[PDB]
Ligand binder design. Structure first.
Ligand SMILES: Nc1nc2c(ncn2[C@@H]2O[C@H](COP(=O)(O)OP(=O)(O)OP(=O)(O)O)[C@@H](O)[C@H]2O)c(=O)[nH]1
Ligand SMILES: Nc1nc2c(ncn2[C@@H]2O[C@H](COP(=O)(O)OP(=O)(O)O)[C@@H](O)[C@H]2O)c(=O)[nH]1
Ligand SMILES: Nc1nc2c(ncn2[C@@H]2O[C@H](COP(=O)(O)OP(=O)(O)O)[C@@H](O)[C@H]2O)c(=O)[nH]1
Ligand SMILES: [Mg+2]
Lengths: 52, 25, 72, 440, 433, 87, 430
């Protein structure tokens, strides 16, 4: 089982409760998703075709 | 103590209504 | 120059102690607010625990939020 | 020394007044008991404006709370800051209005007003040099409009050379939950147009829109709705209580904003509203404050000012700021928008600056706009009034209480004359002596 | 034995007077307590000695709201000012000429005149009253409009020098400001002796591009205004080669009954970074005054003609350099004079250099100059203000707020007709032979 | 010499104002520690009379003890700061 | 002092722009959080050009992201440099265009554009002296093309005397994955003709060929293509932010590269591209930069300039270098290729020099070419449009929501007029 590629909760589509756990008095709007850690670990972003 | 009971009932309903996952679902 | 440095050092130490006293007062206010809130919430939790004559009659003399904070 | 006597009418007025007193008690540093525990000496220089001295260093508000049902009075009293109001200023009837303007104006609101006016007259006579009266109410109900308008008329009869400010929660087009709401609104606007000095129109749909699309709150409750109104109530009278570089009181704002006595319907807005997750991306300085005031989304009424022309604009800034930027932005907006301002008044925009910011901020601003685009509100209320009135729907509840069908017709005619005069003041040329300057 | 009585009326008057009296105290070496630190009497023009050694200003602060005078009553100079020279009404003026003239201003004028009489009976020799105010404000327009009338009733022909905040052509904080300007300068014409004008927009531009301040404030404006009035009165207070009284430049600047409106400029106005770079001589500081970008009134003198001029030099100046500089000024074809004024200048010289105050934005300099010039180029300002008044008045907007307070309708018409005649007066003066 | 004297006087009055405010806050802490002791006796009497309730009562007792100790420490710190300001 | 506002249209525009913002954030030394972590003091002299100040010394980009599908916006926010964007600058629709130009221009691209133009005016009025707009989009989709053209038109109507650059992903024959692509390309090219100051053509097969036969990468992903695009996107505007011996901004390049207002289609190329094996053996100097910018395989367009004539050339160099070599190499190539350059314009080359080298390098150069050989790109799309239109395939999807059949006919008429003008200016005598 892999959760690296599965879509997670949206920050722009449905700005409504009953999607995230706990008690939150403001919308998320922070830019950190659930699979961000595993996505960064499996797929590193290091420069490009140019430069040593 | 009736006033304090009303205050704590207010706090409890605040918790229930601001738990947005449990209120809608 | 030594007299000027002496006076300026005295002024600097006085200002540093002024800022230290102000920070201590702000910390004192924050601690007092936090302890008063915690004690009142604990008392309300105990009252609801009894809710859901020997002790309920005695627990009616709980000090108010003003006495918990320190104003008389 | 310049006192404002507060009046809260109905359930809506009571809850908005409770939130407003909760706001300015923390502004002036007052505990729920009533005493003073603050850090500055400028908080007791001007405190007689809203508060009244008691013994032992206590302060009680100069407010009169009015209701026709005791449940909202009990709810206000059992609140957090409910122990500061004097127990003799709660005036509640025993039988409700039942969402009926006739019940509020002739049958049940005709006996409570003597008891209300006793307290109102004693609070007005206790002052040193009275500045004015303030009212908070809603035109969709029975107690707020039906008896509030009668209180306004009697107060205007007794004290003619004073200031009468009102905060009216006008009906919403989409959020309307009551059926006789256009009846109550149409029979209240004729009173507010004839015997009121300033009227601020506040709309629940616009409040919900700001609380959802700007503040980004998951649960926009009535506490969040009333905080927005209380911020404007604080900002419009902050120049009385706090020092500044360019002061402007309610009399000065009314003089500069009201060109004719039948044109006193304003739109309000509040400047620094941001979200907790999106406040790190924004530096809130004077251009951002002016931008967010003049943004058409930020209006507290359900009227778009792009459809009309700004008759007059006033804004009160709060905090320590430089006056060059304050004058520069308000000249620049008039230079950019050339077609959105009427051309028979040069320099439509008035500025005021106060020194002490509100709670939790360093700079703030408030905008009050007299616009011609308010006429679409009255046109919508008229077109929803006529649809029910032609079929004589819900008319027995009104006509069985001493009313006649001629009063509805005259209310329609005066609303039509109001929208006609707003239209004629919009579509008017500035380069012409029309017919009265025949003296030459 | 020479004295001038200062009357600061309005919020503008009070906030100018704070900076002015701080400057006067620091020049004369008087503490905020009011006592000199240990037979000089140079302070006697502005302060009055008490038997204990205290010094009390010869100023009267007049206002209709308490929120501005209470700052003076509470702050640093709470011991310097007399407790009864700070007069405060109630319920202000609400930007209303009728309120400030007929209803609210009529009440406190008896007390104000009583204080003026008490301050003027102490003067062994009195030169005049200097009135600090603004046209656009309710108090500073309406209350001044009858203060000058009752001053002319009480005192026959004493000098009335006026320091006016003119409305700027673009930026303004009010809407009925043209009404107040018309009704002020209709009734002050025959009752005012001289009126030096400064407006806020030009000083904003000067502070933007000269003092290197990107966000100036009213304090930075009031400091420059205090420098101007101190440069005016320095010839009265200190030594000089040519010393100038107040009657001198009420006589040498007003050639006709309806024209008593000079413009005031100051030079050099530079920062402490540019004072290290730029050499400041008499010719440079006197060309900086004639430069139209350094005007403190937003009007261009190149459109009009100079009617009279008064230059006041302070510091390390010599009459050779003053004469060569003025002769160089007279020969240029850009600078134009009316043909019936072949002798167009007055020159005053003072020995003491200007003083620098803590918290100021200027620099420590050795010489300075203040110019008071009467120009035909304010006819365009009167024409613009007539445009605004007529455009607002064609529909009778904002008129009920004046009529319902005790003013009849015809006074608007007669004031507009009076200034319509004043425009033709300026035209007939400006037409050459 | 007069300039230096004026600066020293201003610093003295600022120090005195701060010391007075800190003394007022220390008195506030003293009355708070004074009043925080009644629930301890109430809890002791409740447990002695009795012998989802016992856990709450034990939590109350632990909270009271922690609050009393921390208030004593804060009072000591306030007295030390007062002494430094006076010196 | 001169601010360029960034516009990102469609999924392709979003990906290209995200890589662009990563590249110039690495250039200006900005962390993913937003603060400045750098070493040189020349990196904060001109940072208001692309970044806008916040509280606490934070810089947010002056970009506007627009899309008709919120999933791509969620992915862009979830990307590595996605937490630096302001939340209000994302504009999202609910239902996508679905590779349809009519949805993007009339049906769904009409209720989103007031919301977009509010944000565009919001960023446009805040600049002290705004320089222009640059937009990144693809002509193969329904969101970047059908709505991007309409935003281009309304921006031209409102702000007349400004500059806009466009990076357009023109579709290609052998990489063409979408059947209905030539309809969108045809209906977009004429709108780009009337209301655009510069158009730069980008072709995916050209990028794939460059990444295959030159850089020698095993897996040439879209990230490695977008890095190649963003290198040119930075090198075009490098002289406006960094000082140099001889400066040239976007307006200065547009004055010289555009001799007639219907001729503003350019091809780009980037000079120092080398592989890992061939990196140590090759010394980078002005001769290698000049030969590799003008080698015909280095183009970012599906084109070959041998078939046509170089109307005008622009070269922007970066790095500390001597001016005589810069003049001398570009004079020598003019001397050698006397048949690949037109004769009615002498001195066909504009040159700019910037002092600051790009990150990780010491010398670099960027080439922009106005040629007539780009006309085959239009002729191929015209013939593939006529092949579909003569059988009327896929026409109901376009005509079922407000579009009549004469818009197509005037579209091939406009392309035919443009290519006839290009042929006339190729086969013209001095
Ligand atoms: N130059 C300068 N002008 C000022 C200052 N303060 C106020 N003003 C001007 O005064 C005008 C308004 O009048 P105010 O002085 O504020 O108030 P007022 O004259 O007492 O009139 P009321 O407010 O009605 O009582 C504004 O247009 C300002 O331009 C100041 O400190 N410096
Ligand atoms: N803005 C605002 N509106 C309110 C509040 N409470 C009630 N309302 C509105 O007021 C309307 C009913 O008014 P009502 O309470 O019957 O007025 P009353 O008859 O004078 O008591 C409802 O449609 C509510 O939406 C409040 O706290 N704030
Ligand atoms: N160069 C480049 N091309 C891309 C990228 N992503 C997609 N494309 C091309 O764009 C085409 C799809 O365009 P599309 O996303 O549907 O455009 P949209 O509908 O406006 O968003 C595909 O054929 C790809 O070849 C990218 O990141 N870089
Ligand atoms: Mg004022």
């Amino acid at each position: 089982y892999s959760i690296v590629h599965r879509k997670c909760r949206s920050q722009f589509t449905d700005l409504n409760g009953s999607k995230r756990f706990g008690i939150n008095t403001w919308h998320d709007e922070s830019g950190i998703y659930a699979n961000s850690d595993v996505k960064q670990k499996l797929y590193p972003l290091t420069s490009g075709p140019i430069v040593p | 103590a009736n006033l304090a009971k009303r205050r704590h009932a207010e706090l409890c309903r605040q918790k229930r209504v601001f738990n947005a996952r449990n209120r809608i679902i | 120059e030594t007299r000027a440095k002496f006076t300026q050092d005295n002024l600097c130490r006085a200002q540093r102690e002024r800022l230290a006293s102000a920070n201590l007062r702000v910390l004192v206010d924050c601690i007092l607010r936090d302890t008063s809130e915690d004690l009142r919430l604990q008392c309300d939790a105990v009252n609801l625990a009894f809710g859901r004559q020997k002790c309920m009659a005695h627990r009616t003399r709980y000090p108010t939020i003003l006495q918990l904070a320190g104003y008389q | 020394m310049r006192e404002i006597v507060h009046l809260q009418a109905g359930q809506c007025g009571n809850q908005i007044g409770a939130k407003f007193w909760e706001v300015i008690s923390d502004e002036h540093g007052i505990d729920p008991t009533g005493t003073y525990h603050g850090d500055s000496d400028l908080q007791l220089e001007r405190i007689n404006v809203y508060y009244n001295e008691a013994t032992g260093g206590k302060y009680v508000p100069r407010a009169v709370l009015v209701d026709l049902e005791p449940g909202t009075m009990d709810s206000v009293r059992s609140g957090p800051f409910g122990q500061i109001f004097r127990p003799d200023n709660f005036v509640f009837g025993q039988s409700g209005a039942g969402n009926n303007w006739a019940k509020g104006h002739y049958t049940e609101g005709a006996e409570l007003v003597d008891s209300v006016l006793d307290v109102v007259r004693k609070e007005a006579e206790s002052c040193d040099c009275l500045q004015g009266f303030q009212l908070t109410h809603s035109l969709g109900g029975g107690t707020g409009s039906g008896m509030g308008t009668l209180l306004i008329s009697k107060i205007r009869e007794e004290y003619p050379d004073r200031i009468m400010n009102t905060f009216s929660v006008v009906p919403s087009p989409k959020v309307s939950d009551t059926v006789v709401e256009p009846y109550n609104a149409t029979l209240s606007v004729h009173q507010l147009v004839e015997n009121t000095d300033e009227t601020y129109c506040i709309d629940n749909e616009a409040l919900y829109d700001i609380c959802f699309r700007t503040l980004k709150l998951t649960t926009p409750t009535y506490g969040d709705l009333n905080h927005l109104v209380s911020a404007t109530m604080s900002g419009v009278t902050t120049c009385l209580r706090f020092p500044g570089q360019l002061n402007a009181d309610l009399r000065k704002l009314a003089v500069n904003m009201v060109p004719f006595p039948r044109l006193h319907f304003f739109m309000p807005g509040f400047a620094p509203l941001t979200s907790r997750g999106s406040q790190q991306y924004r530096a809130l300085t004077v251009p951002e404050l002016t931008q967010q005031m003049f943004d058409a989304k930020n209006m507290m009424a359900a009227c778009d000012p792009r459809h009309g022309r700004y008759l007059t604009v006033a804004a009160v800034f709060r905090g320590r700021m430089s006056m060059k930027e304050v004058d520069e932005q308000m000249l620049n907006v008039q230079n950019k928008n050339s077609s959105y301002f009427v051309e028979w008044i040069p320099n439509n925009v008035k500025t005021a600056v106060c020194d002490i910011p509100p709670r939790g901020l360093k700079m703030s601003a408030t905008f009050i706009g007299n616009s011609t685009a308010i006429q679409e509100l009255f046109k919508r209320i008229s077109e929803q009034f006529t649809a029910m009135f032609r079929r004589k729907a819900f008319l027995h509840w009104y006509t069985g209480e001493g009313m006649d069908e001629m009063e509805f017709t005259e209310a329609e005619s005066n609303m039509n004359d109001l929208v006609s005069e707003y239209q004629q003041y919009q579509d008017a040329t500035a380069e012409e002596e029309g017919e009265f300057e025949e003296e030459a | 034995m020479r004295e001038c009585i200062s009357i600061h009326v309005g919020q503008a008057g009070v906030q100018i007077g704070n900076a002015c009296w701080e400057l006067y105290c620091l020049e004369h070496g008087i503490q905020p307590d009011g006592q000199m630190p240990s037979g000089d009497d140079s302070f006697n023009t502005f302060f009055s000695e008490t038997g204990a050694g205290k010094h009390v200003p010869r100023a009267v602060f007049v206002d209709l709201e308490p929120t501005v005078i209470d700052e003076v009553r509470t702050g640093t100079y709470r011991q310097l000012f007399h407790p009864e020279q700070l007069i405060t009404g109630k319920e202000d003026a609400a930007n209303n000429y009728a309120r400030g003239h007929y209803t609210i201003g009529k009440e406190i004028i008896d007390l104000v005149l009583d204080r003026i009489r008490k301050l003027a009976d102490q003067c062994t020799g009195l030169q005049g009253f200097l009135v600090f105010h603004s046209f656009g404000g309710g108090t500073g327009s309406g209350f001044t409009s009858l203060l000058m009338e009752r001053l002319s009733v009480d005192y026959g022909k004493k000098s009335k020098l006026e320091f006016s905040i003119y409305p700027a052509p673009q930026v303004s904080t009010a809407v009925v400001e043209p009404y107040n300007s018309i009704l002020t300068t209709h009734t002050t014409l025959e009752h005012s002796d001289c009126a030096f004008m400064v407006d806020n927009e030009a000083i904003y531009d000067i502070c933007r591009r000269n003092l290197d301040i990107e966000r100036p404030t009213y304090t930075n404006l009031n400091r420059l205004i205090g420098q101007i009035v101190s440069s005016i009165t320095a010839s009265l207070r200190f030594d000089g080669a040519l010393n100038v009284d107040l009657t001198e430049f009420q006589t040498n600047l007003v050639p006709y009954p309806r024209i008593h409106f000079p413009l005031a400029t100051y030079a050099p106005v530079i920062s402490a970074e540019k004072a290290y770079h730029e050499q400041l001589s008499v010719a440079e500081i006197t060309n900086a005054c004639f430069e139209p970008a350094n005007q403190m009134v937003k009007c261009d003198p190149r459109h009009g003609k100079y009617m009279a001029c008064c230059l006041l030099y302070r510091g390390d100046v010599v009459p050779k350099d003053v004469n060569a500089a003025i002769a160089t000024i007279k020969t240029k074809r850009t600078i134009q004079f009316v043909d019936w004024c072949p002798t167009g200048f007055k020159v005053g010289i003072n020995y003491q250099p200007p003083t620098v105050v803590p918290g100021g934005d200027l620099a420590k300099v050795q010489r300075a100059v203040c110019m008071l010039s009467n120009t035909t180029a304010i006819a365009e300002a009167w024409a613009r203000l007539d445009h605004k008044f007529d455009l607002m008045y064609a529909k009778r907007a904002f008129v009920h707020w004046y009529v319902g307070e005790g003013m009849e309708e015809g006074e608007f018409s007669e004031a507009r007709e009076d200034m319509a005649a004043l425009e033709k007066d300026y035209e007939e003066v400006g037409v050459d032979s | 010499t007069h300039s230096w004297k004026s600066e020293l006087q201003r610093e003295m009055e600022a120090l005195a104002a701060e010391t007075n405010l800190l003394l007022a806050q220390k008195q506030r802490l003293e009355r708070a520690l004074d009043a925080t002791e009644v629930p301890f006796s109430i809890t002791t009497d409740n447990l002695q009379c009795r012998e989802h309730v016992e856990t709450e009562l034990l939590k109350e007792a632990e909270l009271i003890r922690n609050i009393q100790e921390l208030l004593k420490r804060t009072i000591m710190q306030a007295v030390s700061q007062i002494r430094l300001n006076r010196e």
